[PDB]
């Protein structure tokens, strides 16, 4: 029978397995499915490890999450359409669950699906090549359990290896002589480390917002965040200041583009990540900016130069869990023959160009959110993934945006209408800035 | 013509280039030589970078050296037999030159050789395979300058990729909740970070000795080092204590196997490295312990399962620079046909077994030094590499060992007999504990 290789067992790869199992249950014949995962367990970025740099096996650490991390968007906007929060936890929980709770949720669905047997853990993929003569991909992987590398042929490869794990780490004058901690968000683990310290946070996006917030919450003396384009612009706490571009450090003195100066004890680089695939040749390797319209992906999933190769979750993310579902169902259907891809590369390239032009038509944030909503709507209309109230999820994000603009430090103290019932979520039992306990234990009581 | 791929432009790979150049100058026909180097420049571990974890390109950071690092053995034991220190710096320097100074010496030699043109920088090797039908290795590499991967065929591969860069990072109960910095020696950079802190150093070998010493020299409050087998046993300074095995951490409380306890601010894991090759299949991938007799390498260099593949510098090291040379000349001669390898695998395996048994015949430190000395002597006898006074090199290591046993903190304040003259080296212009300046500028005046 045909065989499919899935690279990664994060939310996207897990969605892919769930998709195939769902189709199998309906009586459709499915190909063999083999999922290769570098880590010892599934969950992708939702794993936590104290390790940074390289893991116990010597592979680059995938994890970018830190202690005390909570959902940074409304949970109502990421609910699986086929596995409700209610079905999983039994009851209704708050709108911003901590890391451990969302991991439990992700895990519940694939536990129910009985798809763990398709996964090979501690098995980083080393290489993928395609042979036009045989029409097969050869996947080379290393099993760290046995310390043995092997190769096998597949009819399709679906890459779900994430794009928020290989850091963008710029050099600025003085970085190499600074008497202090300099760490990228990727390797940041414990905000308690910076208690009583003056912290410099470089960047102006999600990681800068939240890591600055963690350092503040866990007692940093002061936060200085610097941008190079547009300021985050929120009304910050009294000990937090936003500066324009960093020019250089001299000793522990940071010099900014406006000529202002500031002594800092540590520097956290929240400068984002790159799309990076250490395991792919030129003819299969996705090269793209991080944005809502991903380069070279037909329908945002099928690699234009070889549409037997697919990619999941490579877009920048407003929507997440249910977007990955929409993609995985779509990719499944393409492989199963429920969807037929163009045999015209020009048509595939035009599809991408339209997506890019439409994304660029406006720089408005609500426009961006609606753009991705439109994408999820597009995909879901084209498979048997259950229709769901995308407009509502959209509204959730809109309200969330307003809540952050109002109070950057208290936006997690809010509730949103479930997309299934339309009922607001319970208020959590402890204000976020007071919620020091990470555990799923403390969260659910 | 035939072609040889050299993986790595550290001391070993550089020695290999030098070896081929020396033969070409004598009128011997040499194969084409292509050297792949992941870093932007040559030098191997001797390159310094402030970066830890992954480099600017997204590749694992090779560098394990830190700020303030000086040569840990007497320079007289690591002189090139074809390029005296005298010839390089013109004059005579001390016996423990800082990193920057030894890098300059390393570079001096290869500059003279005009071998840089054989090197491709920013070009990590991704994979190497061998095809028995064609009798060629296929080497796949990624050029980060152009973001393009390519493949090419070679008649031989010489792997000089180091073995002190992929860390051994053990988990101990409590590591994941410790409120403090936990770094492996590999990512350790600036001792100033631990000034006024209580540091736990885990390990009992070279890195533990020297990193503990740097932390001490740069103002750590206290140093606690722990061993799991044989204690380092030196007379430590008043703020440095040596403890038995770590059991667990609870909060910032370290518990040791003798039941004692110590609160610490940071933990530096000097737990060594593994031999790790992310780019090799089973049938080419060296698997060995770190020791003086390396598994599966005939004469310590030719891979017993495919003797057209060679490895350099994979032994643990008392000797370093001139051992790499001896190996490089020997490998070169095998490739050129000046040396003919056995066609009998059993004989190759027996060579390795003899080396292992002989290494293990005594656990005495001077016996170990003499053992590797004997290895270098063996290799040098078998090529036109210039004989040099190996016995003298030994005597240097012998005196160095005595000096360390005498005063662990002041052994770098000593001199040794130039292997060429027999004249002792001059004393450095500043005692080690006082030389706070890394610069080659200060050292050379
Ligand atoms: C710090 C951070 C916080 C976030 N917080 C939120 C949040 O609160 N809410 C939200 O909705 N979204 C959040 N996101 C977005 C996040 O990307 C998604 O929630 C989700 O983790 C993406 O799933 P994925 O499977 O597409 O990628 P990943 O989760 O990165 O999964 C990739 C998987 O592929 C594996 N892999 C990688 N390379 C290889 C290889 N060579 N061989 C084999 N396996 C490999 C990895 O081990 C990993 O498990 C966050 C992202 C980051 C970086
Ligand atoms: C912290 C530390 C301090 C030391 N101090 C001393 C000292 O004072 N004196 C002394 O004599 N010895 C010292 N040593 C021993 C040291 O190993 C040798 O001096 C020397 O650096 C070894 O040379 P090498 O080329 O064999 O390995 P390395 O120097 O590690 O060279 C390996 C090279 O291969 C490259 N490479 C690796 N993987 C790939 C890939 N996939 N593709 C392409 N290129 C790759 C790397 O970029 C690197 O440049 C020290 C070692 C360490 C770890
Ligand atoms: N759950 C949570 O609380 C949480 C926490 C952290 C992250 N995350 C997730 O992680 C994902 C990644 O977000 P991210 O913010 O880390 O990456 P990102 O969204 O790509 O943002 C990167 C930021 O770094 C800046 N930057 C890039 N290169 C720079 C340079 N050389 N010098 C100075 N600044 C530079 C960019 O500014 P320019 O625009 O000027 O280039 C940009 O603002 C997000 O989707 C987010 O949802 C979640
Ligand atoms: N000043 C300098 O120039 C300098 C500084 C640092 C390093 N170096 C070089 O770097 C090289 C590497 O030396 P290294 O000492 O880092 O590595 P190493 O020589 O292999 O020593 C590793 C040490 O870690 C201990 N260890 C390993 N696993 C452990 C675990 N799970 N728990 C506790 N302890 C554990 C080992 O103890 P056991 O014996 O019990 O296994 C061993 O003593 C050396 O050749 C040295 O020359 C040079």
Curated annotation (Swiss-Prot), chains A, B:
Presence of the UniProt keyword Transmembrane helix in the record? no
**How pH affects activity?**
Optimum pH is 8.0.
The record's catalysed reaction(s) read: trimethylamine + NADPH + O2 = trimethylamine N-oxide + NADP(+) + H2O
Activity over temperature:
Optimum temperature is 30 degrees Celsius.
Residues given in the record as NADP(+) binding sites: 70, 72, 172, 204-205, 207, 228, 412
The protein's enzyme class: oxidoreductase
Q: Which UniProt keywords apply?
A: FAD, Flavoprotein, Monooxygenase, NADP, Oxidoreductase
Under Enzyme Commission nomenclature, its number is: 1.14.13.148
Q: Name one GO molecular function term.
A: flavin adenine dinucleotide binding
Q: Which cofactor does it need?
A: FAD
Can the keyword Oxidoreductase be found in this entry's annotation?
yes
Q: What is the effect of changing residue 316 to A?
A: Strong decrease in activity
Residues the record lists as binding FAD? 12, 37, 39, 45-46, 62, 72, 125, 317, 320
**What does this protein do, in the record's words?**
Catalyzes the oxidation of trimethylamine (TMA) to produce trimethylamine N-oxide (TMAO). TMA is the best substrate, but the enzyme can also oxidize methimazole, indole and dimethylamine (DMA).
Further information in the entry reads:
The catalytic process consists of a reductive half-reaction and an oxidative half-reaction, via the formation of a C4a-hydroperoxyflavin intermediate. NADP(+) undergoes a conformational change in the oxidative half-reaction.
PANTHER family assigned: DIMETHYLANILINE MONOOXYGENASE
Similarity comment: family membership: Belongs to the FMO family.
State the protein's name. Answer: Trimethylamine monooxygenase
């Amino acid at each position: 029978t045909k065989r499919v290789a899935v690279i990664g067992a994060g939310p996207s790869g897990l969605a892919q397995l769930r998709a195939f199992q769902s189709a199998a249950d309906q009586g459709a014949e499915i190909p063999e499915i083999v999922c290769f995962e570098k880590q010892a367990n599934w969950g992708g970025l939702w794993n936590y490890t104290w390790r940074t740099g390289l893991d116990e096996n010597g592979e680059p650490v995938h994890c970018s999450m830190y202690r005390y991390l909570w959902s940074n968007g409304p949970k109502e906007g990421l609910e699986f359409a086929d596995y409700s929060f209610e079905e999983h936890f039994g009851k209704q929980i708050a709108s911003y669950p901590p890391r451990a709770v969302l991991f439990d949720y992700i895990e519940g669905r694939v536990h129910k699906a009985d798809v763990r047997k398709w996964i090979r853990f501690n098995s980083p993929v080393r290489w993928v090549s395609y042979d036009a003569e045989t029409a097969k991909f050869t996947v080379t992987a290393h099993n760290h359990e046995t310390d043995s590398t092997y190769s096998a042929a597949f009819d399709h490869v679906i890459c779900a290896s994430g794009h928020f794990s290989t850091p963008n780490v710029p050099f600025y004058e003085g970085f190499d002589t600074f008497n202090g901690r300099i760490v990228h968000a990727h390797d940041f683990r414990d905000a308690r480390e910076f208690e009583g310290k003056d912290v410099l946070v470089m960047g102006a996006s999600s990681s800068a917002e939240d890591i600055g917030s963690q350092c503040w919450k866990y007692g940093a003396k002061s936060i200085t965040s610097c941008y190079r384009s547009a300021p985050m612009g929120y009304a910050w706490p009294d000990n937090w200041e936003e500066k324009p571009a960093l020019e250089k450090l001299t000793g522990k003195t940071a010099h900014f583009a406006d000529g202002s100066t500031r002594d800092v004890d540590a520097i956290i680089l929240c400068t984002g990540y790159k799309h990076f695939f250490s395991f792919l040749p030129d003819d299969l390797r996705l090269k793209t900016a991080n944005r809502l319209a991903t380069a070279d992906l037909y329908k945002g999933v099928a690699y234009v130069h070889n549409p037997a190769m697919f990619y999941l979750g490579m877009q920048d993310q407003w929507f997440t869990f249910n977007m990955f579902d929409a993609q995985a169902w779509w990719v499944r259907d393409a492989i199963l023959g429920r969807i037929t891809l163009p045999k015209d590369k020009a048509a595939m390239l035009a599809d991408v160009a339209e997506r890019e032009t439409r994304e660029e038509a406006s720089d408005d944030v609500k426009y961006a959110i609606r753009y991705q909503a439109d994408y999820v709507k597009e995909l879901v209309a084209e498979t048997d993934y259950p229709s769901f109230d995308i407009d509502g999820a959209c509204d959730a994000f809109f309200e969330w945006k307003k809540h952050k603009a109002k109070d950057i430090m208290a936006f997690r103290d809010n509730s949103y209408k479930s997309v299934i019932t339309g009922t607001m979520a319970p208020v959590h039992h402890t204000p976020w800035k007071e919620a020091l306990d990470d555990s799923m234990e403390a969260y659910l009581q």
